[PDB]
Amino acid sequence: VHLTRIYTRTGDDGTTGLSDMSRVAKTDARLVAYADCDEANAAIGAALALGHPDTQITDVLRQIQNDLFDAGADLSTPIVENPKHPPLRIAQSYIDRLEGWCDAYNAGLPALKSFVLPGGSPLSALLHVARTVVRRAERSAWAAVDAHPEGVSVLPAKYLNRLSDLLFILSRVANPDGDVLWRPGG
Amino acid sequence: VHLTRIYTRTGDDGTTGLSDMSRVAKTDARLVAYADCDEANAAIGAALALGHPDTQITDVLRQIQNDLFDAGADLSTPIVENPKHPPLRIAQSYIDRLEGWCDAYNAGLPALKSFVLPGGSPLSALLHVARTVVRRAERSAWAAVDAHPEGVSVLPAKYLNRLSDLLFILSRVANPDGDVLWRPGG
Amino acid sequence: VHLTRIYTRTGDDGTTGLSDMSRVAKTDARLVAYADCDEANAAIGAALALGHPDTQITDVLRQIQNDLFDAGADLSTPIVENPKHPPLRIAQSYIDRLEGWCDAYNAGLPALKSFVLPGGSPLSALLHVARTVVRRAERSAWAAVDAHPEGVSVLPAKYLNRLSDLLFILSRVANPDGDVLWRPGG
Ligand SMILES: C[C@H]1O[C@@H](n2cnc3c(N)ncnc32)[C@H](O)[C@@H]1O
Ligand SMILES: C[C@H]1O[C@@H](n2cnc3c(N)ncnc32)[C@H](O)[C@@H]1O
Ligand SMILES: C[C@H]1O[C@@H](n2cnc3c(N)ncnc32)[C@H](O)[C@@H]1O
Ligand SMILES: [Mg+2]
Ligand SMILES: [Mg+2]
Ligand SMILES: [Mg+2]
Ligand SMILES: [Mg+2]
Ligand SMILES: [Mg+2]
Ligand SMILES: [Mg+2]
């Protein structure tokens, strides 16, 4: 894929193209899903640029930013029988990796008896922002499945499901002293 | 409530649970409402972590972050007749408090004859971001009322209504010199 | 227009006013469109306040923040035949200006053979966040056209279309060394 002039004016009527170049409305549920992946990817970039994460988190998050483009390519390309070219799809491989990162980073942390108030470190607060945006993207991914239960894979949404759980764990690690707990009705 | 393993895989089919553990689609309007409260809460955490607010704003905003979890507990728990346990609900008490903070912080500021361009301080700009996210959450809260006018309270949405007004006032105070005014068609 | 008490309680029933003071639901597609313009405007303010953009970008972005209020005034005011007062509307003039900024700032940059991972500079990462929020606003603007193809202009949405292309170019310029490229399935 190529990024040259950037502005082509081909979407000035409110329509645009999926990856097979078929035309959709810019409100199409599939587009909203991989659009929200774009927005989640930018939230992680904000966390990387203002958060000063250590080397090992920067490598995990950079892989996730790359996975999010894999996920968008998946969502933007309709599923067809025997495609001429084999499409890039999300695989259980991706989710297993996320679960391993969850278990590893969640090992050294204790249980919580209530919700944490987002904030603390610049890195911890921005991971929380990214966490909520990924969760919004997950909802859009599931809505895309509802709209096209054959043409859209469930694996992008399952990836986004596990990812927001990992981002939560990482947000706690970025507050190595501890985060403030919600006190109901306090 | 307990946060332990974090990832349970019970939502890998696009369904999830309200606080009474009844099952809903992850696109359910009630969930979208308290999801957007989560996103607004994270925006305030970004304002607290990168904004360096003074002591008195940090205490006001920390209370709001706690109120937002009260509001989410409200929205996530259907209203029923004579519940076995009494549920945590938002009350006029919450909104009266917000109005007092509005009046107090708006006392020392002058009138405006047009809109302000968001920006200035890191604290002022991030309060504006939080302001717009809270307003998005308010719209979702009202949509939840439309979907379930008996099972959902109007008070969460009324809290979110007044809250975005307070966040605007606080955004001006964080620009103690003044913000740039919109000039129509300038 | 005047900003005085801020909180009027007139929207505590989930209704609110367009610029002609006619009443709409707070979920009205037109309101969602200029609400999303507000959210995009705040994202640019975050980019201006934490990004330390040079003088020439700050002047371009400040003009865009002003255009976004022009665009919201357009979207919030229904189109009518022979209005008593002439309404502020977006014009091709606005979009031509954006295209000139695109061409000028895109001149000194090379082609790309794949997507860039958002991040890098605080300014570059926050421009990416703003880029994705503007794109979300564009989708809402097109949905407003669908709901009211006579009462809503297409020009706000076309402005938002070109604007996200410009924000992308500016995000690259704020990484004068280069951004990381997506590697499919890497
Ligand atoms: C932790 C709680 O958050 C809600 N929940 C589950 N999935 C999402 C999502 N993608 N976005 C927002 N809220 C969600 C459910 O109610 C769950 O039980
Ligand atoms: C200030 C103006 O903003 C619009 N307005 C009112 N409530 C909201 C909301 N929750 N989110 C976005 N825009 C809103 C109405 O048009 C109001 O008059
Ligand atoms: C670059 C690709 O992004 C998708 N696209 C086009 N317009 C938007 C928008 N406003 N918001 C999100 N995604 C969009 C289309 O698929 C286009 O081809
Ligand atoms: Mg383009
Ligand atoms: Mg989940
Ligand atoms: Mg989970
Ligand atoms: Mg209001
Ligand atoms: Mg108000
Ligand atoms: Mg476009």
Side-chain angles (χ1 to χ4, degrees), chain C residues 141-157 159-165:
Chain C
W142 284 119
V145 172
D146 296 345
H148 299 285
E150 254 180 284
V152 173
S153 177
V154 297
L155 279 168
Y159 177 89
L160 294 162
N161 193 23
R162 210 75 72 246
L163 170 59
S164 73
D165 280 351

PDB file of all heavy atoms in Angstrom, chain C residues 141-165, unseen atoms left out:
ATOM      1  N   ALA C 141     -20.589  13.907  10.724  1.00  0.00           N
ATOM      2  CA  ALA C 141     -21.084  14.941   9.818  1.00  0.00           C
ATOM      3  C   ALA C 141     -21.834  14.325   8.644  1.00  0.00           C
ATOM      4  O   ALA C 141     -22.884  14.832   8.233  1.00  0.00           O
ATOM      5  CB  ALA C 141     -19.923  15.806   9.326  1.00  0.00           C
ATOM      6  N   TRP C 142     -21.320  13.218   8.101  1.00  0.00           N
ATOM      7  CA  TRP C 142     -22.007  12.549   7.002  1.00  0.00           C
ATOM      8  C   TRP C 142     -23.316  11.926   7.471  1.00  0.00           C
ATOM      9  O   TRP C 142     -24.305  11.923   6.730  1.00  0.00           O
ATOM     10  CB  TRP C 142     -21.101  11.487   6.376  1.00  0.00           C
ATOM     11  CG  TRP C 142     -20.036  12.073   5.507  1.00  0.00           C
ATOM     12  CD1 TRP C 142     -18.686  11.961   5.670  1.00  0.00           C
ATOM     13  CD2 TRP C 142     -20.233  12.882   4.341  1.00  0.00           C
ATOM     14  NE1 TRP C 142     -18.030  12.647   4.678  1.00  0.00           N
ATOM     15  CE2 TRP C 142     -18.958  13.220   3.847  1.00  0.00           C
ATOM     16  CE3 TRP C 142     -21.363  13.347   3.664  1.00  0.00           C
ATOM     17  CZ2 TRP C 142     -18.782  14.007   2.708  1.00  0.00           C
ATOM     18  CZ3 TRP C 142     -21.186  14.126   2.531  1.00  0.00           C
ATOM     19  CH2 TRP C 142     -19.907  14.448   2.067  1.00  0.00           C
ATOM     20  N   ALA C 143     -23.344  11.391   8.695  1.00  0.00           N
ATOM     21  CA  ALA C 143     -24.596  10.865   9.226  1.00  0.00           C
ATOM     22  C   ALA C 143     -25.624  11.975   9.400  1.00  0.00           C
ATOM     23  O   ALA C 143     -26.825  11.742   9.223  1.00  0.00           O
ATOM     24  CB  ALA C 143     -24.348  10.144  10.553  1.00  0.00           C
ATOM     25  N   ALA C 144     -25.175  13.189   9.732  1.00  0.00           N
ATOM     26  CA  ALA C 144     -26.105  14.311   9.819  1.00  0.00           C
ATOM     27  C   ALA C 144     -26.682  14.643   8.448  1.00  0.00           C
ATOM     28  O   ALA C 144     -27.874  14.951   8.326  1.00  0.00           O
ATOM     29  CB  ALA C 144     -25.407  15.530  10.421  1.00  0.00           C
ATOM     30  N   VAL C 145     -25.856  14.574   7.403  1.00  0.00           N
ATOM     31  CA  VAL C 145     -26.363  14.785   6.049  1.00  0.00           C
ATOM     32  C   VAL C 145     -27.418  13.737   5.714  1.00  0.00           C
ATOM     33  O   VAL C 145     -28.485  14.059   5.176  1.00  0.00           O
ATOM     34  CB  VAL C 145     -25.202  14.773   5.038  1.00  0.00           C
ATOM     35  CG1 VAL C 145     -25.731  14.785   3.611  1.00  0.00           C
ATOM     36  CG2 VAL C 145     -24.278  15.963   5.274  1.00  0.00           C
ATOM     37  N   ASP C 146     -27.146  12.467   6.040  1.00  0.00           N
ATOM     38  CA  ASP C 146     -28.122  11.414   5.774  1.00  0.00           C
ATOM     39  C   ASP C 146     -29.451  11.705   6.459  1.00  0.00           C
ATOM     40  O   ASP C 146     -30.521  11.476   5.882  1.00  0.00           O
ATOM     41  CB  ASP C 146     -27.586  10.062   6.245  1.00  0.00           C
ATOM     42  CG  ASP C 146     -26.364   9.617   5.481  1.00  0.00           C
ATOM     43  OD1 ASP C 146     -26.081  10.199   4.413  1.00  0.00           O
ATOM     44  OD2 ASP C 146     -25.683   8.680   5.956  1.00  0.00           O
ATOM     45  N   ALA C 147     -29.403  12.199   7.697  1.00  0.00           N
ATOM     46  CA  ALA C 147     -30.632  12.439   8.440  1.00  0.00           C
ATOM     47  C   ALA C 147     -31.393  13.639   7.898  1.00  0.00           C
ATOM     48  O   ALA C 147     -32.628  13.659   7.947  1.00  0.00           O
ATOM     49  CB  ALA C 147     -30.316  12.641   9.922  1.00  0.00           C
ATOM     50  N   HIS C 148     -30.685  14.639   7.378  1.00  0.00           N
ATOM     51  CA  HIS C 148     -31.298  15.877   6.897  1.00  0.00           C
ATOM     52  C   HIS C 148     -30.568  16.344   5.646  1.00  0.00           C
ATOM     53  O   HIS C 148     -29.808  17.318   5.674  1.00  0.00           O
ATOM     54  CB  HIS C 148     -31.266  16.950   7.987  1.00  0.00           C
ATOM     55  CG  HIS C 148     -32.010  16.570   9.227  1.00  0.00           C
ATOM     56  ND1 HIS C 148     -33.387  16.577   9.302  1.00  0.00           N
ATOM     57  CD2 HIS C 148     -31.570  16.162  10.441  1.00  0.00           C
ATOM     58  CE1 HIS C 148     -33.762  16.197  10.509  1.00  0.00           C
ATOM     59  NE2 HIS C 148     -32.679  15.938  11.220  1.00  0.00           N
ATOM     60  N   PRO C 149     -30.789  15.669   4.513  1.00  0.00           N
ATOM     61  CA  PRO C 149     -30.045  16.016   3.289  1.00  0.00           C
ATOM     62  C   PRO C 149     -30.364  17.393   2.728  1.00  0.00           C
ATOM     63  O   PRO C 149     -29.620  17.868   1.860  1.00  0.00           O
ATOM     64  CB  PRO C 149     -30.450  14.910   2.303  1.00  0.00           C
ATOM     65  CG  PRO C 149     -31.735  14.367   2.833  1.00  0.00           C
ATOM     66  CD  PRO C 149     -31.652  14.491   4.324  1.00  0.00           C
ATOM     67  N   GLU C 150     -31.436  18.045   3.178  1.00  0.00           N
ATOM     68  CA  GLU C 150     -31.728  19.419   2.786  1.00  0.00           C
ATOM     69  C   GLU C 150     -31.279  20.431   3.828  1.00  0.00           C
ATOM     70  O   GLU C 150     -30.727  21.478   3.476  1.00  0.00           O
ATOM     71  CB  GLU C 150     -33.230  19.596   2.536  1.00  0.00           C
ATOM     72  CG  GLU C 150     -33.614  19.699   1.069  1.00  0.00           C
ATOM     73  CD  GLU C 150     -35.115  19.866   0.861  1.00  0.00           C
ATOM     74  OE1 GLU C 150     -35.861  18.871   0.994  1.00  0.00           O
ATOM     75  OE2 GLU C 150     -35.550  20.998   0.560  1.00  0.00           O
ATOM     76  N   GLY C 151     -31.498  20.137   5.107  1.00  0.00           N
ATOM     77  CA  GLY C 151     -31.188  21.082   6.160  1.00  0.00           C
ATOM     78  C   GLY C 151     -29.735  21.143   6.576  1.00  0.00           C
ATOM     79  O   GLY C 151     -29.366  22.063   7.311  1.00  0.00           O
ATOM     80  N   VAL C 152     -28.902  20.201   6.131  1.00  0.00           N
ATOM     81  CA  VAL C 152     -27.502  20.129   6.536  1.00  0.00           C
ATOM     82  C   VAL C 152     -26.628  20.211   5.292  1.00  0.00           C
ATOM     83  O   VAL C 152     -26.893  19.533   4.294  1.00  0.00           O
ATOM     84  CB  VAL C 152     -27.201  18.842   7.326  1.00  0.00           C
ATOM     85  CG1 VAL C 152     -25.701  18.718   7.590  1.00  0.00           C
ATOM     86  CG2 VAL C 152     -27.977  18.830   8.628  1.00  0.00           C
ATOM     87  N   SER C 153     -25.579  21.025   5.367  1.00  0.00           N
ATOM     88  CA  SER C 153     -24.642  21.194   4.266  1.00  0.00           C
ATOM     89  C   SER C 153     -23.627  20.057   4.239  1.00  0.00           C
ATOM     90  O   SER C 153     -23.275  19.482   5.274  1.00  0.00           O
ATOM     91  CB  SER C 153     -23.918  22.536   4.398  1.00  0.00           C
ATOM     92  OG  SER C 153     -22.943  22.705   3.384  1.00  0.00           O
ATOM     93  N   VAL C 154     -23.162  19.727   3.027  1.00  0.00           N
ATOM     94  CA  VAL C 154     -22.098  18.738   2.878  1.00  0.00           C
ATOM     95  C   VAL C 154     -20.718  19.329   3.112  1.00  0.00           C
ATOM     96  O   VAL C 154     -19.747  18.578   3.262  1.00  0.00           O
ATOM     97  CB  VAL C 154     -22.078  18.090   1.478  1.00  0.00           C
ATOM     98  CG1 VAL C 154     -23.363  17.308   1.226  1.00  0.00           C
ATOM     99  CG2 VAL C 154     -21.847  19.148   0.395  1.00  0.00           C
ATOM    100  N   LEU C 155     -20.604  20.652   3.155  1.00  0.00           N
ATOM    101  CA  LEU C 155     -19.303  21.306   3.184  1.00  0.00           C
ATOM    102  C   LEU C 155     -18.592  21.115   4.518  1.00  0.00           C
ATOM    103  O   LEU C 155     -17.367  20.942   4.532  1.00  0.00           O
ATOM    104  CB  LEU C 155     -19.457  22.794   2.868  1.00  0.00           C
ATOM    105  CG  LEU C 155     -19.566  23.074   1.367  1.00  0.00           C
ATOM    106  CD1 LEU C 155     -20.017  24.499   1.104  1.00  0.00           C
ATOM    107  CD2 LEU C 155     -18.242  22.786   0.677  1.00  0.00           C
ATOM    108  N   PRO C 156     -19.293  21.145   5.656  1.00  0.00           N
ATOM    109  CA  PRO C 156     -18.619  20.781   6.917  1.00  0.00           C
ATOM    110  C   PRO C 156     -17.945  19.420   6.843  1.00  0.00           C
ATOM    111  O   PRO C 156     -16.782  19.283   7.243  1.00  0.00           O
ATOM    112  CB  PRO C 156     -19.759  20.822   7.944  1.00  0.00           C
ATOM    113  CG  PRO C 156     -20.732  21.805   7.381  1.00  0.00           C
ATOM    114  CD  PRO C 156     -20.674  21.613   5.887  1.00  0.00           C
ATOM    115  N   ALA C 157     -18.640  18.411   6.312  1.00  0.00           N
ATOM    116  CA  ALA C 157     -18.049  17.083   6.203  1.00  0.00           C
ATOM    117  C   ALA C 157     -16.893  17.068   5.214  1.00  0.00           C
ATOM    118  O   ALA C 157     -15.889  16.377   5.433  1.00  0.00           O
ATOM    119  CB  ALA C 157     -19.114  16.068   5.790  1.00  0.00           C
ATOM    120  N   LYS C 158     -17.001  17.813   4.114  1.00  0.00           N
ATOM    121  CA  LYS C 158     -15.879  17.860   3.186  1.00  0.00           C
ATOM    122  C   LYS C 158     -14.690  18.599   3.806  1.00  0.00           C
ATOM    123  O   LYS C 158     -13.541  18.204   3.608  1.00  0.00           O
ATOM    124  CB  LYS C 158     -16.299  18.504   1.868  1.00  0.00           C
ATOM    125  N   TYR C 159     -14.951  19.636   4.600  1.00  0.00           N
ATOM    126  CA  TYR C 159     -13.856  20.270   5.335  1.00  0.00           C
ATOM    127  C   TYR C 159     -13.181  19.268   6.265  1.00  0.00           C
ATOM    128  O   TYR C 159     -11.952  19.147   6.282  1.00  0.00           O
ATOM    129  CB  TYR C 159     -14.376  21.467   6.132  1.00  0.00           C
ATOM    130  CG  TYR C 159     -13.303  22.116   6.976  1.00  0.00           C
ATOM    131  CD1 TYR C 159     -12.506  23.125   6.459  1.00  0.00           C
ATOM    132  CD2 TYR C 159     -13.081  21.711   8.287  1.00  0.00           C
ATOM    133  CE1 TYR C 159     -11.518  23.715   7.220  1.00  0.00           C
ATOM    134  CE2 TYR C 159     -12.095  22.294   9.055  1.00  0.00           C
ATOM    135  CZ  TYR C 159     -11.316  23.296   8.516  1.00  0.00           C
ATOM    136  OH  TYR C 159     -10.333  23.876   9.280  1.00  0.00           O
ATOM    137  N   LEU C 160     -13.979  18.536   7.047  1.00  0.00           N
ATOM    138  CA  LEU C 160     -13.413  17.551   7.963  1.00  0.00           C
ATOM    139  C   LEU C 160     -12.678  16.453   7.211  1.00  0.00           C
ATOM    140  O   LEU C 160     -11.696  15.903   7.721  1.00  0.00           O
ATOM    141  CB  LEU C 160     -14.517  16.954   8.833  1.00  0.00           C
ATOM    142  CG  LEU C 160     -15.181  17.928   9.808  1.00  0.00           C
ATOM    143  CD1 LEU C 160     -16.521  17.390  10.292  1.00  0.00           C
ATOM    144  CD2 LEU C 160     -14.265  18.209  10.981  1.00  0.00           C
ATOM    145  N   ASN C 161     -13.130  16.120   6.000  1.00  0.00           N
ATOM    146  CA  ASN C 161     -12.424  15.131   5.195  1.00  0.00           C
ATOM    147  C   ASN C 161     -11.003  15.593   4.897  1.00  0.00           C
ATOM    148  O   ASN C 161     -10.030  14.892   5.193  1.00  0.00           O
ATOM    149  CB  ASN C 161     -13.188  14.869   3.895  1.00  0.00           C
ATOM    150  CG  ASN C 161     -12.685  13.643   3.157  1.00  0.00           C
ATOM    151  OD1 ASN C 161     -12.081  12.751   3.753  1.00  0.00           O
ATOM    152  ND2 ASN C 161     -12.933  13.593   1.850  1.00  0.00           N
ATOM    153  N   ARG C 162     -10.866  16.786   4.310  1.00  0.00           N
ATOM    154  CA  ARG C 162      -9.538  17.278   3.963  1.00  0.00           C
ATOM    155  C   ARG C 162      -8.696  17.540   5.205  1.00  0.00           C
ATOM    156  O   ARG C 162      -7.474  17.362   5.168  1.00  0.00           O
ATOM    157  CB  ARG C 162      -9.655  18.549   3.115  1.00  0.00           C
ATOM    158  CG  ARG C 162      -8.507  18.760   2.134  1.00  0.00           C
ATOM    159  CD  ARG C 162      -8.603  17.837   0.920  1.00  0.00           C
ATOM    160  NE  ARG C 162      -9.688  18.220   0.018  1.00  0.00           N
ATOM    161  CZ  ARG C 162     -10.783  17.498  -0.219  1.00  0.00           C
ATOM    162  NH1 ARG C 162     -10.974  16.326   0.373  1.00  0.00           N
ATOM    163  NH2 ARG C 162     -11.699  17.957  -1.059  1.00  0.00           N
ATOM    164  N   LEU C 163      -9.327  17.934   6.316  1.00  0.00           N
ATOM    165  CA  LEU C 163      -8.566  18.294   7.510  1.00  0.00           C
ATOM    166  C   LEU C 163      -7.789  17.106   8.063  1.00  0.00           C
ATOM    167  O   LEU C 163      -6.632  17.253   8.473  1.00  0.00           O
ATOM    168  CB  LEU C 163      -9.497  18.864   8.580  1.00  0.00           C
ATOM    169  CG  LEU C 163      -8.903  19.069   9.976  1.00  0.00           C
ATOM    170  CD1 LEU C 163      -7.705  20.012   9.943  1.00  0.00           C
ATOM    171  CD2 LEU C 163      -9.967  19.593  10.933  1.00  0.00           C
ATOM    172  N   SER C 164      -8.407  15.922   8.108  1.00  0.00           N
ATOM    173  CA  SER C 164      -7.688  14.768   8.639  1.00  0.00           C
ATOM    174  C   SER C 164      -6.501  14.400   7.758  1.00  0.00           C
ATOM    175  O   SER C 164      -5.500  13.873   8.257  1.00  0.00           O
ATOM    176  CB  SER C 164      -8.625  13.569   8.794  1.00  0.00           C
ATOM    177  OG  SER C 164      -8.967  13.006   7.543  1.00  0.00           O
ATOM    178  N   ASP C 165      -6.585  14.672   6.455  1.00  0.00           N
ATOM    179  CA  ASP C 165      -5.430  14.462   5.588  1.00  0.00           C
ATOM    180  C   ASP C 165      -4.299  15.426   5.947  1.00  0.00           C
ATOM    181  O   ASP C 165      -3.128  15.031   5.986  1.00  0.00           O
ATOM    182  CB  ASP C 165      -5.839  14.617   4.118  1.00  0.00           C
ATOM    183  CG  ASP C 165      -6.518  13.360   3.541  1.00  0.00           C
ATOM    184  OD1 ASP C 165      -6.531  12.292   4.191  1.00  0.00           O
ATOM    185  OD2 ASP C 165      -7.040  13.428   2.409  1.00  0.00           O
TER     186      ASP C 165
END
